[PDB]
Amino acid sequence: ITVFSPEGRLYQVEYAREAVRRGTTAIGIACKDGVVLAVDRRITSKLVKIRSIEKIFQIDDHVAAATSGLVADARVLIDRARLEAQIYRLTYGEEISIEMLAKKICDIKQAYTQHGGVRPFGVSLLIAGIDKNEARLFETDPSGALIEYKATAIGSGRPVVMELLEKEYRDDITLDEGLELAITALTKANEDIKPENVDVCIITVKDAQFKKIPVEEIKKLIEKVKKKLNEE
Amino acid sequence: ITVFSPEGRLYQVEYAREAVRRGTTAIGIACKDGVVLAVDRRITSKLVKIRSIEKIFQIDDHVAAATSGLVADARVLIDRARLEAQIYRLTYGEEISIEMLAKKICDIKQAYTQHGGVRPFGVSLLIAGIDKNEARLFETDPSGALIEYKATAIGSGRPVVMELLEKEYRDDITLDEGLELAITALTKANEDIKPENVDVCIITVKDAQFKKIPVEEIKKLIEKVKKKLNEE
Amino acid sequence: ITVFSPEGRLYQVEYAREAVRRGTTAIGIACKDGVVLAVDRRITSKLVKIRSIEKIFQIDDHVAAATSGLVADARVLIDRARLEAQIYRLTYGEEISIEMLAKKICDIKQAYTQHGGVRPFGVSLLIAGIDKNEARLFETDPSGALIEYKATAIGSGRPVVMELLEKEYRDDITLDEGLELAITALTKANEDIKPENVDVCIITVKDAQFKKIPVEEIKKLIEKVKKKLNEE
Amino acid sequence: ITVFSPEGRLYQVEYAREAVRRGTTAIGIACKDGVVLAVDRRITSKLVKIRSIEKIFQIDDHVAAATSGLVADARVLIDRARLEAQIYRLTYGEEISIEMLAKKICDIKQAYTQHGGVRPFGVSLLIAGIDKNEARLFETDPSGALIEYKATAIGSGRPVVMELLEKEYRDDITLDEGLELAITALTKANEDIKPENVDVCIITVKDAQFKKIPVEEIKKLIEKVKKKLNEE
Amino acid sequence: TTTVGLICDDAVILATDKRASLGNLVADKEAKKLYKIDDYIAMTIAGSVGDAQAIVRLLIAEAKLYKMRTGRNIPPLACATLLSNILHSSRMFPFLTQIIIGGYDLLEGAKLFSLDPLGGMNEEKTFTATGSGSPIAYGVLEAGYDRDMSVEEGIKLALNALKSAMERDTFSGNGISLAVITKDGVKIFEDEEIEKILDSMK
Amino acid sequence: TTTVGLICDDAVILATDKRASLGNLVADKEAKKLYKIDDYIAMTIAGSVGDAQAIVRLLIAEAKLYKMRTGRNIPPLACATLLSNILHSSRMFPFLTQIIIGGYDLLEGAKLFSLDPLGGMNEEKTFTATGSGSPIAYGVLEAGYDRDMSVEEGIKLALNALKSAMERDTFSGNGISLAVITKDGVKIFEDEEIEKILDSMK
């Protein structure tokens, strides 16, 4: 009562991807000094407190993840990873490995694919953290995702930046070096981004801990941007 | 045995959205002094005790919400919101946080999206109250909804006022400054509204409590109105 | 495996509605002295004991309801209201509240609407009684019904009287004042009604109790009627 | 609530087959010294840590398998073969018998074929281990697979090499003789494979143990390859 | 472990003893034994702590819910008849604990309900008490109670019951708490002020 | 098996005894009985190890979840009312063990809660202690404690409860552990530094 395709591919599954590439955009970036995420909410009307548009979720003291698709299946997938996460810390004592955490909820997404009477999750996810000194980043697909990026993006302007990064990125980039990376990138796909329409989460490996970024740090860096709309 | 779309969107879901854009109009408004709701019943025949057309429901001593869509699915969601809430209060003691309470029924509502043999709820909600000195307002969509407005509206006249408010609201507006806002707005979409066709429920933050407005306060404020149908 | 509409409405739901607008008529009227109900059975052939045509049911010493729609789903809903009614009295001791009894069977009917595999009920209801000195009236619909009337009607000639009442009713009318109301009304829709084709049941708030009306009382009052078919 | 065909064949299963011949290619080879596996990831973008593109899995200390098809159903079968692999070891003490372990998840695979509401797994497996001095290799099929090869391959370049091997294999070939066998073979289907686009896994029978091959062992062997593109 | 309820004219009074009694050891120098569930009703726990503990919470919710689902603040003699049922369910089961509930009925006025661990419920018209040292407290009332003894001559007599029991029962008697429910509300007395009274007494 | 909790001005002090007591046999010469569940909360286990043991892990995980799902670090008096609930689940069942939770409320200040196996909970405003050798430690407090004391005058009195009990209880009295929860955090005292104190003492 789900689906399968007439030749290689798979019905519903790919339709539910689209849901994502239509979704809000959001880039995740690795490095060596930690790892930071960021998303481009497209809050249009200004009657909606920006605090609510939840695009990035904490999952453990040391590992968090960012959404893109429908926020129907955003939440439910997190107060559930957030769940599969502490369970693990509980029947071991280990801050749950990130690769594992991923390999869990991405398996769940995968079961929802092949079972009678249940549409897959209209979402892809960006999980990053500190797997014991190793700050890493993953991308989930509404049907399994073994993709450990050094940096990527999902949603609206995927190819826009998912191909910007394609070049200049490098495996040494520092945090304040990747600082801009996402901001500049995110702007390419959003020609006119409010400076709070956006969300920044930092997780430095320098302490196995997750931090926020206040508004206007956002803007004061969205400034190194007017020098990018020139013969390029 | 529900549905999913052939390219990004989602069948039953949106069809059920409409059900809402067809239901009665409803406005919700935050502020800094608390928060106030109000709904335009369109009680046609005058043979119906206006007391039964429940369009707004208290969900705790400190948080309540207003309905828009089909009353079939109205009550059921609240006789069940009123429920997740008091459960919480007994497995903690804490008057249930508002962002959570939302993040519960707007979770169920999402669950009713992707599961064998069951139609999503024909409803959007407006949930407001006092989350510890912080008065806030939320919109739900028949499938997950992280939209925390400073103020908004749903129902028949969404675009009338959901695009009036677009301008003249202020992250300053008080309660009695927002007194009129909702009354005045609601008239826009309803030329000729009975004073009592309407409901008014005030939750001041100044006491974490929920109050009522009698008829004629309604009317005596639906009077600053005849000066709004002039060249505008 | 039920339904939902392609633009706001809902499939089976309304189709089930018609079933009612086709069924036998029935009027219930509130007042200030209690509350009275009545129904125009349309017993054609005279080979059927009229005592079997059940169209009004007692639900408790103080509350009773009248059926309209198919007699298949008539009984089942009542030999079950009759349950959710004595259940309450048992887990409290209180003669069950009428706005609660209603909101109950009316919540079930609702569930029958949105759930895989099962046809909603072909009946709208008329429920009334004495909620603690307060004699009230309620109408239900094959999917939720928050309608507490001062008086209304359903079935055959809904619009006949449901729009007769629409004028001359008064928030004052007494019991022996609503005496005629229903009777005259019911006659309007049914040109030529047998005098027992009809069923009368009076709950006075003057004792919290349920009474019956004998044939010929019915007739002798269907008498002030021949003065109504004159230039009106 | 799956499928069957109108004349012998079987709907979904073969549509699900395709999904494999579509996936990434993979080759496994037996012999007499052990047996070895290798796969051709087709990591296009160089933004993805080649470490997470998982295409070969270990199942026990003495047995392992390589994927092909969709990875959603890659993991779920292995962290499910991995299980039934240690279950056995616990209810006997015997390193589970390769022939049996295979006969297991392939059964599973089959059962998903004839059961209401669930799509067969989009994957063929290449299982290889040391079954008591007897090193062997099997190919699974999205619905049963009693095939014990002396070498084979799955996926993309199925025909290219599953018909190259067709000739020059020998029930003699050594390990370092099957060295190039799968590399050269693999090259045929992928004109231009990166030298790390490939994984290598060696299970010598002479220690019942499973080993890795480092990069540029990979390359320094993909070199005996340029002398393969000449009038042939 | 010792509490007291009585009806006196207008409304209803309740009192306890903030003493917790871990077998030989005195465990809590101030243990709450009097709870308000609804703006109009309040109750008193006697006996199994963590048991009566839950029954509170696993009842307060049910109130500030009925209240909501139907306006009228769960009329007391209804809410009571919940416990008679909330208890009796665990008869087949190991429930246990004492309890007094009192509140001012929307209309019917003041009400006072005793209650056993099984589920036996009884409306007390006069005065009733419960707690390790209850029978002490009891003598007091049953030779210190008249049909109509003022809003004062009740909360006096109330204390005095505890005064006795508290100092003639191994288990009761550490500090004291009290509230009086009446039409317009429910008053939890902040320790300090209670005191005034027995100062103004003997 | 012996713990102490007490409020002294700013925050709250907790201490235990690293002694595992396997019947006649001294089993552990250093067994934790003091755990920090959240950055603002921490606790002391007394009694059935393997039972409290799980009750810790089968809890921290419920904290470092609530913290996430809703920012606020599980407000202590809330996390407590879990245990009250968590335990009582196993009333119908075999549960058991003691417990003190001591942590700083984001706003409401310092909090100290006591907890019996069934599910009985009380907020201890002053001081409370539990363990095999509790009533020994107790006596110490009940005659060496003043509303105000100090940050210092607390951790002193603190040890000196254990000091008695630990040498007057067959079951308590091997090594000692101590942490203090205050607004800005929770300090586990690394043994060596603990010692400093009774040196500077008598």
UniProtKB/Swiss-Prot annotation, chains A, B, C, D:
InterPro entries the record matches: Ntn_hydrolases_N, Proteasome_alpha, Proteasome_alpha-type, Proteasome_asu_arc, Proteasome_asu_N, Proteasome_sua/b
GO aspect biological process, one term: proteasome-mediated ubiquitin-dependent protein catabolic process
Protein name: Proteasome subunit alpha
Assembly, per entry: The 20S proteasome core is composed of 14 alpha and 14 beta subunits that assemble into four stacked heptameric rings, resulting in a barrel-shaped structure. The two inner rings, each composed of seven catalytic beta subunits, are sandwiched by two outer rings, each composed of seven alpha subunits. The catalytic chamber with the active sites is on the inside of the barrel. Has a gated structure, the ends of the cylinder being occluded by the N-termini of the alpha-subunits. Is capped at one or both ends by the proteasome regulatory ATPase, PAN.
Gene name of this polypeptide: psmA
Matching Pfam families: Proteasome (PF00227), Proteasome_A_N (PF10584)
SUPFAM superfamilies per UniProt: N-terminal nucleophile aminohydrolases (Ntn hydrolases) (SSF56235)
Keyword Cytoplasm attached: yes
Single GO molecular function: endopeptidase activity
Top-level taxon: Archaea
Annotated family: Belongs to the peptidase T1A family.
UniProt keywords, alphabetically: Cytoplasm, Proteasome
Recorded GO CC terms: cytoplasm; proteasome core complex, alpha-subunit complex
Organism: Methanocaldococcus jannaschii (strain ATCC 43067 / DSM 2661 / JAL-1 / JCM 10045 / NBRC 100440)
Activity modulation comment: The formation of the proteasomal ATPase PAN-20S proteasome complex, via the docking of the C-termini of PAN into the intersubunit pockets in the alpha-rings, triggers opening of the gate for substrate entry. Interconversion between the open-gate and close-gate conformations leads to a dynamic regulation of the 20S proteasome proteolysis activity.
From Swiss-Prot, chains E, F:
PROSITE patterns for this protein: PROTEASOME_BETA_1 (PS00854), PROTEASOME_BETA_2 (PS51476)
List of catalytic residues: T1 (nucleophile)
Enzyme kind, highest EC tier: hydrolase
Activity regulation, free text: The formation of the proteasomal ATPase PAN-20S proteasome complex, via the docking of the C-termini of PAN into the intersubunit pockets in the alpha-rings, triggers opening of the gate for substrate entry. Interconversion between the open-gate and close-gate conformations leads to a dynamic regulation of the 20S proteasome proteolysis activity.
UniProt feature coiled coil, ranges: none
Reactions the enzyme catalyzes: Cleavage of peptide bonds with very broad specificity
EC numbers for this chain: 3.4.25.1
GO cellular component: cytosol; proteasome core complex, beta-subunit complex
Biological process annotations from GO: proteasomal protein catabolic process; proteasome-mediated ubiquitin-dependent protein catabolic process
CDD domains the UniProt entry points to: proteasome_beta_archeal
GO terms of molecular function: endopeptidase activity; threonine-type endopeptidase activity
Subunit comment: The 20S proteasome core is composed of 14 alpha and 14 beta subunits that assemble into four stacked heptameric rings, resulting in a barrel-shaped structure. The two inner rings, each composed of seven catalytic beta subunits, are sandwiched by two outer rings, each composed of seven alpha subunits. The catalytic chamber with the active sites is on the inside of the barrel. Has a gated structure, the ends of the cylinder being occluded by the N-termini of the alpha-subunits. Is capped at one or both ends by the proteasome regulatory ATPase, PAN.
Function (record text): Component of the proteasome core, a large protease complex with broad specificity involved in protein degradation. The M.jannaschii proteasome is able to cleave oligopeptides after Glu, Asp, Tyr, Phe, Trp, slightly after Arg, but not after Ala. Thus, displays caspase-like and chymotrypsin-like activities and low level of trypsin-like activity.
Family: Belongs to the peptidase T1B family.
This protein's name: Proteasome subunit beta
Organism: Methanocaldococcus jannaschii (strain ATCC 43067 / DSM 2661 / JAL-1 / JCM 10045 / NBRC 100440) (Methanococcus jannaschii)
Gene designation: psmB
